[PDB]
Amino acid sequence: XXXXXXXXXXXXXXXXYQVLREKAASQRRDVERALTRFMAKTGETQSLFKDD
């Protein structure tokens, strides 16, 4: 079969349930902290310590 016949490649299952929703929720946390850092250094800023 290694020369004559052929096959088909789908190649991406990735269906690991808890791992999937870990990916999604971790990404949501990322976008949270990203926009936080952005408007953090963007707008009027007051701190918790001095100069953070």
Added chain:
Amino acid sequence: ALANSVTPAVSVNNEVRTLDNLNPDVRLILEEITRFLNMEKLLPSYRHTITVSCLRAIRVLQKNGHVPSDPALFKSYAEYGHFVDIRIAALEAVVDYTKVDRSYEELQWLLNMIQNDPVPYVRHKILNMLTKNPPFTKNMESPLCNEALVDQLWKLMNSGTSHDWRLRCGAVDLYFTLFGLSRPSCL
């Protein structure tokens, strides 16, 4: 629940002051509450109720000495153009600040704003939970109410309080708690 992750005993000697960027799980809690404060600055969902619980959390963090005992955040949330509930929780917070910490100046500010603001219900709740949670507690007078604070308080019972009945009723409650049935040990 994170506010009820009360950890009083990290700073053994002096760790208040950006020293560890104080550590370690406290910082994670700080990350989450910082997130939610800026989310409700952006999203805001329903009365800034999240922001309210956050402000209570930040004060309880000051009551364990991790973010230092500084009112200027809460002061910047006792301002005019916010919601009531934000403002009302900031006032509860800064009242306990002036309870345990001995800030004379912000007490003076507080009484000046009891005099001066348009909203009634903040004056109502300032005086209510000021009396529920007092500084200057009677016959325990280390922060020296006898100097001129009795004077201005007597004034605010008399003056500046013919707006409403209940404001001077609260001032009656103030003199009930602070030095009730007597001379205040002035003269």
